[PDB]
Amino acid sequence: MKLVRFLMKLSHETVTIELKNGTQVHGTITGVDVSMNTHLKAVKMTLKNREPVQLETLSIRGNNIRYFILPDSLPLDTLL
């Protein structure tokens, strides 16, 4: 089974997407597509050796994301 279907069924979850170029955006992920496009609202982004700015909305691509961090209160058996 593909791992994109498990990530597509996630809404209103405070996740942290760490990008490839030293960027990490922590926020409530509101939308996920089949191409791993993560659209989040009211997030905080921290770049490589920079101050963490706050954005009202963000849309990270699939190839630009390096890793993800989920909360502890998220079962993985029902999502797969």
Binding site: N21, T23, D33, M45, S59, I60, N64
Partner: protein, 82 residues
């Protein structure tokens, strides 16, 4: 869904892979993460390379810019459609 088309024709700032930020009115998009930014302005930060020098950002306006998905990293909304 259609979350990418909800923020169309607004003053959005897309972060590039090299560290620059292109702010413009994203009028057209596609499935390959392409963007058509009308009246776009690209801002790139410069290194101070000293102990007392500050960090500056050179900004240049280009107009209509067709940015491919290979360099686009993340796009954030900055301003409403005028």
């Amino acid at each position: 869904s259609s979350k990418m088309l909800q923020h169309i024709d607004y003053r959005m700032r897309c972060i590039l892979q090299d560290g620059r930020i292109f702010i413009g009115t994203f009028k057209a998009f596609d499935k390959h993460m392409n963007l058509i930014l009308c009246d776009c302005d690209e801002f790139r930060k410069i290194k101070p390379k000293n102990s007392k020098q500050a960090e500056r950002e050179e900004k240049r306006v280009l107009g209509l810019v067709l940015l491919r998905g290979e360099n686009l990293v993340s796009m954030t909304v900055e301003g409403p459609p005028p």
